[PDB]
């Protein structure tokens with residue numbers, strides 16, 4: 327079965343999932359000089375006031391916070407997107423140490439972790455239909471930059487001890503995902519994929535340029551989770567990130583001017 331280790335990790339996934347070598351794979355390195363500022367890119371509209379979190383779970387590859395996506399409670403619109411995308415879950419990727427953990431990189435810089443807020447296009451009626459479509463998902467990616475403690479992450483950190491091994495889950499209600507957003511919503515965007523098998527090319531990626539903070543103590547609690555199930559040999563859940571993939575025939579667009587000397 328696929329994983330993140332030496333024998334079953336990302337460099338092996340193509341054997342069972344040939345789309346791993348596809349045209350539109352994620353994550354990518356965001357080369358900020360090469361990216362194209364598009365002055366027509368519209369602002370994002372993050373409407374999370376009515377978000378309803380339900381459960382937190384260790385799925386053996388990350389932990390997910392699941393939301394009630396039965397109505398337009400928490401939605402993402404705008405930017406490169408047509409219509410409305412409903413928030414279904416968020417999860418993180420992180421490292422064995424503070425110097426790595428993100429999936430996207432920025433000018434080859436790795437952050438300590440990356441948050442993925444996963445939304446599906448209401449055009450398609452449910453997640454399972456949406457994931458089969460090229461415009462099915464929108465993932466909002468947010469970097470976690472190691473530094474001062476982040477109160478917005480603390481309710482998450484404080485429940486992780488309850489989900490240490492694969493298959494465990496816990497109640498997780500009234501969590502406000504607005505607390506995980508940076509002040510600026512300027513972004514890069516490109517068409518890409520799920521970053522785990524089956525690696526489907528169904529995602530409009532929206533990566534925020536401004537990171538959020540996380541302390542070393544907070545991210546260390548992520549590293550206390552385990553990939554394995556209870557009773558199997560201990561395999562700490564660390565380095566659950568896929569390496570960057572080639573852009574190929576894509577161009578990353580920026581909603582903003584990152585380098586003033588280029589404009």
Ligand SMILES: [Zn+2]
Nearest residue numbers: 417419442521
């Ligand atoms: Zn992810």
